[PDB]
Structures are given as C-alpha cells and as structure tokens.
Amino acid sequence: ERFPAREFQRDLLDWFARERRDLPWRKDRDPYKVWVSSVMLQQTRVETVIPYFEQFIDRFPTLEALADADEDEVLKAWEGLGYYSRVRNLHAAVKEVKTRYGGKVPDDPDEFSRLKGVGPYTVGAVLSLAYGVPEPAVDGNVMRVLSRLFLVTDDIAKPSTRKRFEQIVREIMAYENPGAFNEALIELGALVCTPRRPSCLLCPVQAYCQAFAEGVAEELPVKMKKTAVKQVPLAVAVLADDEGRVLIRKRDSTGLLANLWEFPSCETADGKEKLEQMVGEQYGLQVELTEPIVSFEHAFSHLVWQLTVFPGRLVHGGPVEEPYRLAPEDELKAYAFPVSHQRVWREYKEWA
DNA sequence: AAGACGTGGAC
DNA sequence: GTCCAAGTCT
Ligand code: SF4
Ligand SMILES: [Ca+2]
Ligand SMILES: [Ca+2]
C-alpha cells in the first residue's frame, strides 16, 4: 500500500531499455519462439542456451515444423542441454496446438497451462511477451529480486511464498506493457540483483529496496541447503569389432536419460564380470574385455554416477538384437548421447 | 507432496 | 567446490 509502483516502473523499464542484452529470442515476439526459449531456459543459463536456440530454430523454424518432425531429431537437437523431458513435453505440446488449437499458441492462461511442460513461469513468459497478457512470470531471478525488494524471509520453495510473489507482481506490474515488465524483473536479477554480491550501488531500484535498507540482501532469498546425493557406481564397456563398429544401446522411453543412446552399462565392484555376463546374455554375442582405462564422476541433481570404462572387442555370430546396435565410429556423431557417455567415448578415443 | 529429472556458467 | 540457472512432472 505504501509502495510507489508507477515510480518503480519508470526506473526499471528505463534501465531495461538501456541494458537489455541482445539475445536470439528478442529479435521478435513469435509465441512459438518465446515458448521455445522459455522452455530451454528452464534451469539452464542464458549463455548456455544461446547457441542451442539458434540451432533449434534452424532445424525447426515453426510450431508446425517441430510437430511434423521425428522424436529422434527433436532429441538430438536438445543433446547436452539436460532435463530432456522438457523437449518430449514441448514436442507433444506443439502437436496438441496443431490439432486442438489450429497451430495458434493459446492466449488463455488456463488453456496454455494445460499443455505439457507449461507451468507458471512458462505461462507468464509466453503470454505476456507474445500476447500482452498480464500473467506473472515468476522464476528464480524474480523471487530473489522480490524477496530483497519486499523482505520476504520465507523459503521461496513454499506455495504460500510463491503465492505472495504472484500477488506482489499483480500489484506492482505495469499493465501497459506486461511483457517488458516481466522481462525486466528477470534481467535485473540476471545482471544486477545477483545471488552473490549484488550490485546494489549499480541498481536502478535501490530506493525501493527494503533489503538494501536493512543490509540483509546477501541473506536473501531463503533457499534450502542441498542434502547429499546418492553415489552410483557404473561399469561401461566400449566394445568394438573387426569391422570397427562400436556396440551401443538405446535407453528406455521412461526414466533417466530417456530415449538416449549409451554404451553398455551395468551396476557395480568386479565390473568386468557383471559386464561380460550382460553382453553374453544377448543372442549371438561373445565378449572379452581388458583392464579399465579411466574412472570419472558425472553429476545429476538427484544423484552422482561414478563411471568406469572397460575397453574391449566383440564377436557377434549374427544380428545384434535390439535395443543394441553396432555403429561405425564415423556414424556415432549422428546418435544422441548423454554428456556422461560423450565423455566415455573421448576417454576411449584418446586412450589409443 | 516428495522427489526425479542434466548440465555447466560464474565465481 | 559450490551454488543455482529466465522449473516441471504429478
Ligand atoms: S538494491 Fe541490491 S538487493 Fe535491492 S534490488 Fe537492487 S541489486 Fe537487488
Ligand atoms: Ca500447467
Ligand atoms: Ca525404464
């Protein structure tokens, strides 16, 4: 009630007009391209995402293009970006738009939000940017800026807190330009109101900041500490044959690293025993392995893989039954692999 | 709800 | 080495 919204809006939107970064998705306001950027940015950094966006749109320039495309090429476009469920959900959602909504991204929040991958941030980011809808796009940058502006001491993970934020944004938003107001809060947490050592003396909205006044900015926002993750020992065989082809396999449609290709992998601490028993269980397949060559960790949010690579060679009497395949070295670059098994191949290739 | 779900920028 | 990124599934 004592907050000068209109003055806060003049200062934020002037700063934004000067200091807004030139990013590939800011060249226009196509609902599709905003949506694609919003999804790619989820838990991924702007610098990390820039080259991906440029390549994705080249392969898939329109909503209709991504929907007519095969799930395999859609995934190879996301290769290395992580959280790969976003792209299977984004691909499924663009199909629903083509059918039910006639290739026009919905502009009703509740219809858009009913598409897969579209949550409260994606709803705000697409509808406000491309359609002028005044829906808050409350991401990690906004929570940190708002918790500092308004001294929100509560865990930003709580639904009550996320409601407080949504309501703050509805009060203070500039309904003249919902998009730029939403995009400017983000840019401010990205370039000024940073997590560690914020640039408060370089901030256009320092006068309106309550955490600046009390000198508690560094203590906010309030997020929980990560509890240790499980460590998962993994044995990986890079098997070749006399023709040079490498044995690979595709992972399940459901689970971790779904529908990605990997080298045969097993639980573990003998390893060389558990891996031969597995490849030998395939029809017409005989394996003799060597001594390991590298052992590296690969981190996930929820767990950490402790990988160990065992080189070797393979003799197959006949056709390698799916899910396995034999692929020349030249042709590994076509399949989509997780970053962990991209490393597995580097450490095997330099080992020669 | 709680946890599953990838990776690396930026210090 | 540590945090968390323009978060979402259900
Ligand atoms: S004054 Fe400091 S803490 Fe407050 S919004 Fe600006 S950068 Fe963030
Ligand atoms: Ca939703
Ligand atoms: Ca599975």
User: The dihedral of CA A206, A208, A214, A217: what is its sign?
Assistant: negative
State whether the beta carbon of A167 lies below 7 angstroms from any atom of strand C. Answer: no
Pairing state of beta strands A230-240 and A265-267? antiparallel
Look at residues A139, A122, A138 and name the one whose alpha carbon lies nearest to residue A130. Answer: A122
State whether the beta carbon of A55 lies below 7 angstroms from any atom of strand B. Answer: no
State whether the beta carbon of A196 lies below 7 angstroms from any atom of strand B. Answer: yes
Residue entry with tokens 């702007």? A46
- The size of chain A, in residues, is 352
Mutation probe of ligand 1 site: the residue of A149, A186, A210 with most atoms within 8 A of C-beta: A149
A261 CA to centre of ligand 3 in angstroms: 13
Tokens of A342: 């991209």
Amino acid at A66: L
Look at residues A224, A241, A232 and name the one whose alpha carbon lies nearest to residue A313. Answer: A241
Q: Distance between CA atoms of A41 and A288, rounded to whole angstroms?
A: 44
Look at residues A255, A211, A146, A177 and name the one whose alpha carbon lies nearest to residue A13. Answer: A177
A253 CA to centre of ligand 3 in angstroms: 6
Q: Distance between CA atoms of A51 and A93, rounded to whole angstroms?
A: 23
Q: Distance between CA atoms of A208 and A323, rounded to whole angstroms?
A: 59
Tell which atom from ligand 1 comes closest to the C-alpha of A189.
Answer: 8
Look at residues A47, A67, A57, A51 and name the one whose alpha carbon lies nearest to residue A116. Answer: A67
Tokens of A209: 């900041």
Question: Concatenated DSSP letters for A49-83?
Answer: HHHHHHHHHHH--SHHHHHHS-HHHHHHHTTTSS-
Confirm if A138 and A47 have CB atoms less than 8 A apart. Answer: no
Ligand number with the minimum distance to the CA of A209: 1
Q: Distance between CA atoms of A334 and A316, rounded to whole angstroms?
A: 23
Boundaries of every domain in chain A: 1-21+134-229, 22-133, 230-352
Q: Distance between CA atoms of A46 and A119, rounded to whole angstroms?
A: 19
Distance A15 CA to B3 C1' (A): 39
Q: Distance between CA atoms of A90 and A117, rounded to whole angstroms?
A: 6
Confirm if A285 and A314 have CB atoms less than 8 A apart. Answer: yes
Look at residues A256, A282, A267, A271 and name the one whose alpha carbon lies nearest to residue A312. Answer: A271
Tokens of A88: 């299977």
Listed in order, strand segments (DSSP E) in A241-329 are 246-250, 261-262, 265-267, 285-289, 294-299, 303-316, 324-327
Beta bridge partners of A232: A305
Neighbours of A195 (CB within 10 A): 13
Q: Residues near A324 by Cβ (< 8 Å), separated by ≥ 6?
A: A247, A248, A249, A264, A282
Query: Which nucleotide has its C1' atom closest to residue A83's CA?
Result: B6
Mutation probe of ligand 1 site: the residue of A12, A192, A201 with most atoms within 8 A of C-beta: A192
Distance A262 CA to B2 C1' (A): 29
Tokens of A220: 């906010």
Tokens of A62: 């329109």
Write down the experimental method used for this entry: X-ray
Kindly list the protein residues whose Cβ atom lies closer than 6 A to any atom of ligand 1: A 145, 148-149, 192-193, 198-200, 203, 205-206, 209, 211-212, 217
Helix/strand/coil for A177:
coil
Q: Distance between CA atoms of A84 and A74, rounded to whole angstroms?
A: 10
Q: Residues near A326 by Cβ (< 8 Å), separated by ≥ 6?
A: A241, A243, A245, A246, A247, A248, A316, A320
Residue entry with tokens 């299977």? A88
Phi-psi sector, A103: left (phi>0), alpha (psi -120 to 50), beta: left
